[PDB]
PDB file of all heavy atoms in Angstrom:
ATOM      1  N   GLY A 226      98.629  33.716  38.975  1.00  2.00           N
ATOM      2  CA  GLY A 226      97.498  33.064  38.714  1.00  2.00           C
ATOM      3  C   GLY A 226      96.964  32.041  39.812  1.00  2.00           C
ATOM      4  O   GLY A 226      95.873  31.883  40.208  1.00  2.00           O
ATOM      5  N   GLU A 227      98.046  31.225  40.359  1.00  2.00           N
ATOM      6  CA  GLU A 227      97.719  30.287  41.330  1.00  2.00           C
ATOM      7  C   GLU A 227      97.238  30.878  42.649  1.00  2.00           C
ATOM      8  O   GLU A 227      96.340  30.395  43.299  1.00  2.00           O
ATOM      9  CB  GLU A 227      98.934  29.360  41.754  1.00  2.00           C
ATOM     10  CG  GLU A 227     100.201  30.125  41.897  1.00  2.00           C
ATOM     11  CD  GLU A 227     101.377  29.141  41.676  1.00  2.00           C
ATOM     12  OE1 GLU A 227     101.457  28.337  40.887  1.00  2.00           O
ATOM     13  OE2 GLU A 227     102.293  29.340  42.556  1.00  2.00           O
ATOM     14  N   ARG A 228      97.649  32.132  42.947  1.00  2.00           N
ATOM     15  CA  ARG A 228      97.048  32.916  44.094  1.00  2.00           C
ATOM     16  C   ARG A 228      95.813  33.508  43.711  1.00  2.00           C
ATOM     17  O   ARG A 228      95.022  33.810  44.553  1.00  2.00           O
ATOM     18  CB  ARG A 228      98.191  33.889  44.562  1.00  2.00           C
ATOM     19  CG  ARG A 228      99.157  33.414  45.621  1.00  2.00           C
ATOM     20  CD  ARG A 228     100.464  34.016  45.327  1.00  2.00           C
ATOM     21  NE  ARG A 228     101.471  33.286  45.925  1.00  2.00           N
ATOM     22  CZ  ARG A 228     102.165  32.206  45.366  1.00  2.00           C
ATOM     23  NH1 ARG A 228     101.971  31.767  44.098  1.00  2.00           N
ATOM     24  NH2 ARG A 228     103.083  31.571  46.076  1.00  2.00           N
ATOM     25  N   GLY A 229      95.597  33.711  42.499  1.00  2.00           N
ATOM     26  CA  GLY A 229      94.399  34.391  41.958  1.00  2.00           C
ATOM     27  C   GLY A 229      93.378  33.128  41.679  1.00  2.00           C
ATOM     28  O   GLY A 229      93.090  32.280  42.484  1.00  2.00           O
ATOM     29  N   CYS A 230      92.641  33.378  40.517  1.00  2.00           N
ATOM     30  CA  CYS A 230      91.415  32.657  40.317  1.00  2.00           C
ATOM     31  C   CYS A 230      91.645  31.092  40.210  1.00  2.00           C
ATOM     32  O   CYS A 230      90.793  30.325  40.438  1.00  2.00           O
ATOM     33  CB  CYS A 230      90.682  33.080  39.028  1.00  2.00           C
ATOM     34  SG  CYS A 230      91.431  32.972  37.499  1.00  2.00           S
ATOM     35  N   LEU A 231      92.861  30.674  39.840  1.00  2.00           N
ATOM     36  CA  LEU A 231      93.271  29.256  39.630  1.00  2.00           C
ATOM     37  C   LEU A 231      93.077  28.491  40.930  1.00  2.00           C
ATOM     38  O   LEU A 231      92.456  27.365  40.881  1.00  2.00           O
ATOM     39  CB  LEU A 231      94.562  29.062  39.072  1.00  2.00           C
ATOM     40  CG  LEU A 231      94.969  29.761  37.710  1.00  2.00           C
ATOM     41  CD1 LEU A 231      96.269  29.108  37.312  1.00  2.00           C
ATOM     42  CD2 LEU A 231      93.950  29.563  36.575  1.00  2.00           C
ATOM     43  N   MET A 232      93.413  29.156  42.129  1.00  2.00           N
ATOM     44  CA  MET A 232      93.276  28.519  43.348  1.00  2.00           C
ATOM     45  C   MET A 232      92.785  29.386  44.496  1.00  2.00           C
ATOM     46  O   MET A 232      91.837  28.970  45.136  1.00  2.00           O
ATOM     47  CB  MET A 232      94.578  27.687  43.661  1.00  2.00           C
ATOM     48  CG  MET A 232      95.400  27.267  42.677  1.00  2.00           C
ATOM     49  SD  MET A 232      96.925  26.364  43.072  1.00  2.00           S
ATOM     50  CE  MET A 232      96.434  25.262  44.430  1.00  2.00           C
ATOM     51  N   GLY A 233      93.476  30.359  44.708  1.00  2.00           N
ATOM     52  CA  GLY A 233      93.146  31.181  45.909  1.00  2.00           C
ATOM     53  C   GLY A 233      91.930  32.073  45.791  1.00  2.00           C
ATOM     54  O   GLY A 233      91.153  32.100  46.595  1.00  2.00           O
ATOM     55  N   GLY A 234      91.748  32.574  44.537  1.00  2.00           N
ATOM     56  CA  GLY A 234      90.513  33.391  44.356  1.00  2.00           C
ATOM     57  C   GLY A 234      89.344  32.517  44.348  1.00  2.00           C
ATOM     58  O   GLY A 234      88.382  32.977  44.912  1.00  2.00           O
ATOM     59  N   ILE A 235      89.365  31.483  43.547  1.00  2.00           N
ATOM     60  CA  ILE A 235      88.094  30.691  43.297  1.00  2.00           C
ATOM     61  C   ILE A 235      87.725  30.209  44.653  1.00  2.00           C
ATOM     62  O   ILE A 235      86.360  30.190  45.006  1.00  2.00           O
ATOM     63  CB  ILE A 235      88.316  29.463  42.360  1.00  2.00           C
ATOM     64  CG1 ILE A 235      86.911  29.016  41.895  1.00  2.00           C
ATOM     65  CG2 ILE A 235      89.142  28.377  42.782  1.00  2.00           C
ATOM     66  CD1 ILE A 235      86.130  29.943  41.134  1.00  2.00           C
ATOM     67  N   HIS A 236      88.603  29.878  45.471  1.00  2.00           N
ATOM     68  CA  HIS A 236      88.085  29.157  46.790  1.00  2.00           C
ATOM     69  C   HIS A 236      87.584  30.383  47.763  1.00  2.00           C
ATOM     70  O   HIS A 236      86.651  30.171  48.456  1.00  2.00           O
ATOM     71  CB  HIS A 236      89.363  28.733  47.517  1.00  2.00           C
ATOM     72  CG  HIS A 236      89.090  27.828  48.729  1.00  2.00           C
ATOM     73  ND1 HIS A 236      90.075  27.533  49.753  1.00  2.00           N
ATOM     74  CD2 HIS A 236      88.022  27.236  49.108  1.00  2.00           C
ATOM     75  CE1 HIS A 236      89.455  26.912  50.633  1.00  2.00           C
ATOM     76  NE2 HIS A 236      88.275  26.659  50.343  1.00  2.00           N
ATOM     77  N   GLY A 237      88.320  31.621  47.827  1.00  2.00           N
ATOM     78  CA  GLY A 237      87.673  32.665  48.601  1.00  2.00           C
ATOM     79  C   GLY A 237      86.322  32.969  48.057  1.00  2.00           C
ATOM     80  O   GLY A 237      85.403  33.299  48.904  1.00  2.00           O
ATOM     81  N   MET A 238      86.142  33.051  46.747  1.00  2.00           N
ATOM     82  CA  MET A 238      84.812  33.363  46.114  1.00  2.00           C
ATOM     83  C   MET A 238      83.874  32.396  46.668  1.00  2.00           C
ATOM     84  O   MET A 238      82.734  32.746  47.200  1.00  2.00           O
ATOM     85  CB  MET A 238      84.937  33.226  44.608  1.00  2.00           C
ATOM     86  CG  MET A 238      83.592  33.494  43.931  1.00  2.00           C
ATOM     87  SD  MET A 238      83.709  34.811  42.671  1.00  2.00           S
ATOM     88  CE  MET A 238      84.310  33.739  41.319  1.00  2.00           C
ATOM     89  N   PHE A 239      84.155  31.039  46.517  1.00  2.00           N
ATOM     90  CA  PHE A 239      83.097  30.009  47.043  1.00  2.00           C
ATOM     91  C   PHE A 239      82.867  30.226  48.509  1.00  2.00           C
ATOM     92  O   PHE A 239      81.637  30.197  48.881  1.00  2.00           O
ATOM     93  CB  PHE A 239      83.747  28.611  46.786  1.00  2.00           C
ATOM     94  CG  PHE A 239      83.700  28.135  45.471  1.00  2.00           C
ATOM     95  CD1 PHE A 239      84.507  27.048  44.995  1.00  2.00           C
ATOM     96  CD2 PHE A 239      82.990  28.740  44.475  1.00  2.00           C
ATOM     97  CE1 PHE A 239      84.489  26.542  43.760  1.00  2.00           C
ATOM     98  CE2 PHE A 239      82.897  28.287  43.139  1.00  2.00           C
ATOM     99  CZ  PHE A 239      83.775  27.241  42.760  1.00  2.00           C
ATOM    100  N   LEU A 240      83.895  30.584  49.337  1.00  2.00           N
ATOM    101  CA  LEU A 240      83.655  30.628  50.785  1.00  2.00           C
ATOM    102  C   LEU A 240      82.848  31.800  51.116  1.00  2.00           C
ATOM    103  O   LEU A 240      81.912  31.709  52.007  1.00  2.00           O
ATOM    104  CB  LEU A 240      85.045  30.827  51.467  1.00  2.00           C
ATOM    105  CG  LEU A 240      85.948  29.574  51.353  1.00  2.00           C
ATOM    106  CD1 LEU A 240      87.211  29.866  52.084  1.00  2.00           C
ATOM    107  CD2 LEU A 240      85.248  28.225  51.716  1.00  2.00           C
ATOM    108  N   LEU A 303      87.347  43.340  42.687  1.00  2.00           N
ATOM    109  CA  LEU A 303      88.582  42.445  42.727  1.00  2.00           C
ATOM    110  C   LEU A 303      89.793  43.005  42.031  1.00  2.00           C
ATOM    111  O   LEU A 303      90.908  42.642  42.334  1.00  2.00           O
ATOM    112  CB  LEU A 303      88.275  41.107  41.983  1.00  2.00           C
ATOM    113  CG  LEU A 303      87.196  40.193  42.499  1.00  2.00           C
ATOM    114  CD1 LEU A 303      86.676  39.307  41.576  1.00  2.00           C
ATOM    115  CD2 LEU A 303      87.893  39.405  43.724  1.00  2.00           C
ATOM    116  N   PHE A 307      93.809  42.379  42.790  1.00  2.00           N
ATOM    117  CA  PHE A 307      94.575  41.787  41.825  1.00  2.00           C
ATOM    118  C   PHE A 307      95.946  42.601  41.505  1.00  2.00           C
ATOM    119  O   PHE A 307      96.978  41.942  41.345  1.00  2.00           O
ATOM    120  CB  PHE A 307      93.819  41.525  40.500  1.00  2.00           C
ATOM    121  CG  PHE A 307      93.182  40.162  40.601  1.00  2.00           C
ATOM    122  CD1 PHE A 307      91.720  40.166  40.520  1.00  2.00           C
ATOM    123  CD2 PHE A 307      93.863  39.080  40.685  1.00  2.00           C
ATOM    124  CE1 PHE A 307      91.069  38.948  40.578  1.00  2.00           C
ATOM    125  CE2 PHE A 307      93.080  37.696  40.682  1.00  2.00           C
ATOM    126  CZ  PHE A 307      91.790  37.722  40.652  1.00  2.00           C
TER     127      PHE A 307
ATOM    128  N   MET B 238      85.854  38.027  38.034  1.00  7.96           N
ATOM    129  CA  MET B 238      87.202  37.638  38.412  1.00  7.96           C
ATOM    130  C   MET B 238      88.075  37.502  37.244  1.00  7.96           C
ATOM    131  O   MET B 238      89.226  38.001  37.145  1.00  7.96           O
ATOM    132  CB  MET B 238      86.934  36.374  39.252  1.00  7.96           C
ATOM    133  CG  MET B 238      88.383  35.866  39.821  1.00  7.96           C
ATOM    134  SD  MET B 238      88.215  34.576  41.017  1.00  7.96           S
ATOM    135  CE  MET B 238      87.468  35.616  42.359  1.00  7.96           C
ATOM    136  N   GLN B 242      91.407  39.709  36.681  1.00  4.63           N
ATOM    137  CA  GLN B 242      92.720  39.093  36.689  1.00  4.63           C
ATOM    138  C   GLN B 242      93.404  39.150  35.428  1.00  4.63           C
ATOM    139  O   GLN B 242      94.769  39.346  35.320  1.00  4.63           O
ATOM    140  CB  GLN B 242      92.610  37.594  37.062  1.00  4.63           C
ATOM    141  CG  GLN B 242      93.939  36.760  36.862  1.00  4.63           C
ATOM    142  CD  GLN B 242      93.982  35.471  37.546  1.00  4.63           C
ATOM    143  OE1 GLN B 242      93.351  35.220  38.602  1.00  4.63           O
ATOM    144  NE2 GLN B 242      94.734  34.471  36.913  1.00  4.63           N
ATOM    145  N   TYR B 269      89.658  23.580  37.830  1.00  2.00           N
ATOM    146  CA  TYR B 269      88.350  23.584  38.298  1.00  2.00           C
ATOM    147  C   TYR B 269      87.714  22.195  38.207  1.00  2.00           C
ATOM    148  O   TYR B 269      86.823  21.917  38.992  1.00  2.00           O
ATOM    149  CB  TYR B 269      87.483  24.594  37.548  1.00  2.00           C
ATOM    150  CG  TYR B 269      87.803  26.060  37.874  1.00  2.00           C
ATOM    151  CD1 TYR B 269      88.891  26.313  38.822  1.00  2.00           C
ATOM    152  CD2 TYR B 269      87.045  27.092  37.245  1.00  2.00           C
ATOM    153  CE1 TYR B 269      89.145  27.720  39.176  1.00  2.00           C
ATOM    154  CE2 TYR B 269      87.414  28.500  37.650  1.00  2.00           C
ATOM    155  CZ  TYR B 269      88.331  28.696  38.496  1.00  2.00           C
ATOM    156  OH  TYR B 269      88.601  30.060  38.723  1.00  2.00           O
ATOM    157  N   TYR B 281      94.157  21.476  45.642  1.00  2.00           N
ATOM    158  CA  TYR B 281      95.359  22.058  46.245  1.00  2.00           C
ATOM    159  C   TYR B 281      96.503  21.128  46.370  1.00  2.00           C
ATOM    160  O   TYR B 281      97.670  21.448  45.972  1.00  2.00           O
ATOM    161  CB  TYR B 281      95.163  22.659  47.631  1.00  2.00           C
ATOM    162  CG  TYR B 281      94.509  24.030  47.729  1.00  2.00           C
ATOM    163  CD1 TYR B 281      93.611  24.536  46.656  1.00  2.00           C
ATOM    164  CD2 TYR B 281      94.747  24.894  48.794  1.00  2.00           C
ATOM    165  CE1 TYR B 281      93.044  25.729  46.588  1.00  2.00           C
ATOM    166  CE2 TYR B 281      94.162  26.143  48.750  1.00  2.00           C
ATOM    167  CZ  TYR B 281      93.387  26.575  47.701  1.00  2.00           C
ATOM    168  OH  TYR B 281      92.750  27.832  47.773  1.00  2.00           O
ATOM    169  N   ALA B 292      98.137  29.882  47.489  1.00  2.00           N
ATOM    170  CA  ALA B 292      96.657  29.694  47.635  1.00  2.00           C
ATOM    171  C   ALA B 292      96.186  29.801  49.130  1.00  2.00           C
ATOM    172  O   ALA B 292      95.230  30.470  49.428  1.00  2.00           O
ATOM    173  CB  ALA B 292      96.179  28.426  46.968  1.00  2.00           C
ATOM    174  N   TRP B 295      96.187  33.387  50.381  1.00  2.00           N
ATOM    175  CA  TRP B 295      95.254  34.359  49.707  1.00  2.00           C
ATOM    176  C   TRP B 295      93.825  33.985  49.648  1.00  2.00           C
ATOM    177  O   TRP B 295      92.977  34.981  49.511  1.00  2.00           O
ATOM    178  CB  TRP B 295      95.753  34.750  48.332  1.00  2.00           C
ATOM    179  CG  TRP B 295      97.000  35.489  48.262  1.00  2.00           C
ATOM    180  CD1 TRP B 295      98.294  35.065  48.447  1.00  2.00           C
ATOM    181  CD2 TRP B 295      97.059  36.917  48.094  1.00  2.00           C
ATOM    182  NE1 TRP B 295      99.068  36.130  48.372  1.00  2.00           N
ATOM    183  CE2 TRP B 295      98.342  37.358  48.127  1.00  2.00           C
ATOM    184  CE3 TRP B 295      96.118  37.906  47.649  1.00  2.00           C
ATOM    185  CZ2 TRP B 295      98.829  38.645  47.834  1.00  2.00           C
ATOM    186  CZ3 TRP B 295      96.468  39.263  47.502  1.00  2.00           C
ATOM    187  CH2 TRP B 295      97.909  39.557  47.592  1.00  2.00           C
ATOM    188  N   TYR B 296      93.420  32.857  49.895  1.00  2.00           N
ATOM    189  CA  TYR B 296      91.891  32.525  49.874  1.00  2.00           C
ATOM    190  C   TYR B 296      91.161  33.264  50.934  1.00  2.00           C
ATOM    191  O   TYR B 296      90.059  33.751  50.666  1.00  2.00           O
ATOM    192  CB  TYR B 296      91.605  31.060  49.887  1.00  2.00           C
ATOM    193  CG  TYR B 296      91.657  30.316  51.199  1.00  2.00           C
ATOM    194  CD1 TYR B 296      90.632  30.412  52.116  1.00  2.00           C
ATOM    195  CD2 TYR B 296      92.754  29.480  51.529  1.00  2.00           C
ATOM    196  CE1 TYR B 296      90.566  29.751  53.314  1.00  2.00           C
ATOM    197  CE2 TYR B 296      92.736  28.851  52.839  1.00  2.00           C
ATOM    198  CZ  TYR B 296      91.668  28.848  53.586  1.00  2.00           C
ATOM    199  OH  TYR B 296      91.680  28.245  54.775  1.00  2.00           O
ATOM    200  N   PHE B 299      90.722  36.925  49.407  1.00  2.00           N
ATOM    201  CA  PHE B 299      89.695  37.007  48.406  1.00  2.00           C
ATOM    202  C   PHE B 299      88.277  36.886  49.110  1.00  2.00           C
ATOM    203  O   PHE B 299      87.390  37.528  48.663  1.00  2.00           O
ATOM    204  CB  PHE B 299      89.831  36.115  47.404  1.00  2.00           C
ATOM    205  CG  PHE B 299      90.836  36.410  46.257  1.00  2.00           C
ATOM    206  CD1 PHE B 299      92.150  36.055  46.346  1.00  2.00           C
ATOM    207  CD2 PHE B 299      90.474  37.174  45.159  1.00  2.00           C
ATOM    208  CE1 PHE B 299      93.039  36.488  45.420  1.00  2.00           C
ATOM    209  CE2 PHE B 299      91.292  37.578  44.161  1.00  2.00           C
ATOM    210  CZ  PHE B 299      92.646  37.197  44.471  1.00  2.00           C
ATOM    211  N   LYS B 300      88.125  35.939  50.048  1.00  2.00           N
ATOM    212  CA  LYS B 300      87.007  35.910  50.743  1.00  2.00           C
ATOM    213  C   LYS B 300      86.523  37.161  51.473  1.00  2.00           C
ATOM    214  O   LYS B 300      85.336  37.686  51.268  1.00  2.00           O
ATOM    215  CB  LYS B 300      87.052  34.759  51.936  1.00  2.00           C
ATOM    216  CG  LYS B 300      85.862  34.694  52.671  1.00  2.00           C
ATOM    217  CD  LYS B 300      85.991  33.523  53.802  1.00  2.00           C
ATOM    218  CE  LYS B 300      85.192  33.913  55.048  1.00  2.00           C
ATOM    219  NZ  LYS B 300      84.031  32.881  55.224  1.00  2.00           N
ATOM    220  N   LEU B 303      85.454  39.962  48.940  1.00  2.00           N
ATOM    221  CA  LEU B 303      84.189  39.540  48.169  1.00  2.00           C
ATOM    222  C   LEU B 303      82.879  39.533  48.986  1.00  2.00           C
ATOM    223  O   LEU B 303      81.939  39.918  48.491  1.00  2.00           O
ATOM    224  CB  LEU B 303      84.411  38.124  47.461  1.00  2.00           C
ATOM    225  CG  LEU B 303      85.076  38.197  46.162  1.00  2.00           C
ATOM    226  CD1 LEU B 303      84.829  36.925  45.354  1.00  2.00           C
ATOM    227  CD2 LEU B 303      84.670  39.254  45.385  1.00  2.00           C
TER     228      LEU B 303
END
Side-chain angles (χ1 to χ4, degrees):
Chain A
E227 46 198 40
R228 274 140 199 92
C230 62
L231 300 191
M232 328 181 40
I235 195 69
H236 190 206
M238 179 131 77
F239 286 165
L240 299 183
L303 294 159
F307 272 115
Chain B
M238 180 166 295
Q242 163 164 337
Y269 287 3
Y281 276 32
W295 284 77
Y296 83 77
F299 278 93
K300 176 182 151 115
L303 278 195

